[PDB]
Design an enzyme around this catalytic site. Structure first.
Site, short mmCIF file in Angstrom:
data_model
loop_
_atom_site.label_atom_id
_atom_site.label_comp_id
_atom_site.label_asym_id
_atom_site.label_seq_id
_atom_site.Cartn_x
_atom_site.Cartn_y
_atom_site.Cartn_z
CD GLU A 89 33.04 79.40 14.35
OE1 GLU A 89 33.31 78.18 14.43
OE2 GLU A 89 31.91 79.83 14.01
CG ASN A 102 31.48 70.50 9.64
OD1 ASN A 102 31.97 71.16 8.73
ND2 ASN A 102 31.47 70.91 10.90
CG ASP A 104 28.58 68.34 5.64
OD1 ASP A 104 29.66 68.34 6.27
OD2 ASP A 104 28.26 69.28 4.88
CB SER A 116 32.20 69.86 4.93
OG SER A 116 31.41 70.23 6.04
CG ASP A 164 33.85 73.71 10.13
OD1 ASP A 164 33.26 73.91 9.05
OD2 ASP A 164 33.32 73.14 11.11
CG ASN A 188 31.89 73.83 5.90
OD1 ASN A 188 31.31 73.58 4.86
ND2 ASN A 188 32.05 72.93 6.85
CG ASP A 248 26.79 83.63 0.31
OD1 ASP A 248 27.13 83.58 -0.89
OD2 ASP A 248 26.00 82.81 0.83
#
Ligand SMILES: [Cl-]
Ligand SMILES: [Cl-]
Ligand SMILES: [Cl-]
Length: 129
Positions: free
Chosen positions: A35, A46, A48, A50, A52, A59, A101
């Site tokens: 990562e 990203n 979209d 967003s 990280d 994110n 989650d």
């Protein structure tokens, strides 16, 4: 801060990540390697919109607030900047929520693609832990 491999393993263990939700320390170190290359200041934008953040590239769509991700949540209740600190506490605490989650470490696409099913113990080999 760019952590050493064993240094990060030790910090993750200190913060209770080792075997958290059944994921051995090598899984977490492997995920951080791919990562962020162990760099707490890593950021990536990203498609979209967003972003990280940090050693585990957490994110802003769901987990932290950066003020510039429309329609997003902040489920870890932290500014995304907290995920860039030399102190990994915020990243670890948030990762604990993420991995709980539902989909485990599959939440980290890079873990799924590069760590899952591999000899992850190699990431902590030789480390005084
Ligand atoms: Cl391991
Ligand atoms: Cl936002
Ligand atoms: Cl990937």
């Amino acid at each position: 801060k760019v952590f050493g491999r064993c240094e990060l393993a030790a910090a993750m263990k200190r913060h209770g990540l080792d075997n958290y939700r059944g994921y051995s320390l090598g899984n977490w170190v492997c995920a951080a390697k791919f990562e962020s290359n162990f760099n707490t200041q890593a950021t990536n934008r990203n498609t979209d919109g967003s972003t990280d953040y940090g050693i585990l590239q957490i994110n802003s769509r769901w987990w932290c607030n950066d003020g510039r991700t429309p329609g997003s949540r902040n489920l870890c209740n932290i500014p995304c900047s907290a995920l860039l600190s030399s102190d990994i506490t915020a990243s670890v605490n948030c990762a604990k929520k993420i991995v709980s989650d539902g989909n485990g470490m599959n939440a980290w696409v890079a873990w799924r693609n590069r760590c899952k099913g591999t000899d992850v113990q190699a990431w902590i080999r030789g480390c005084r832990l």
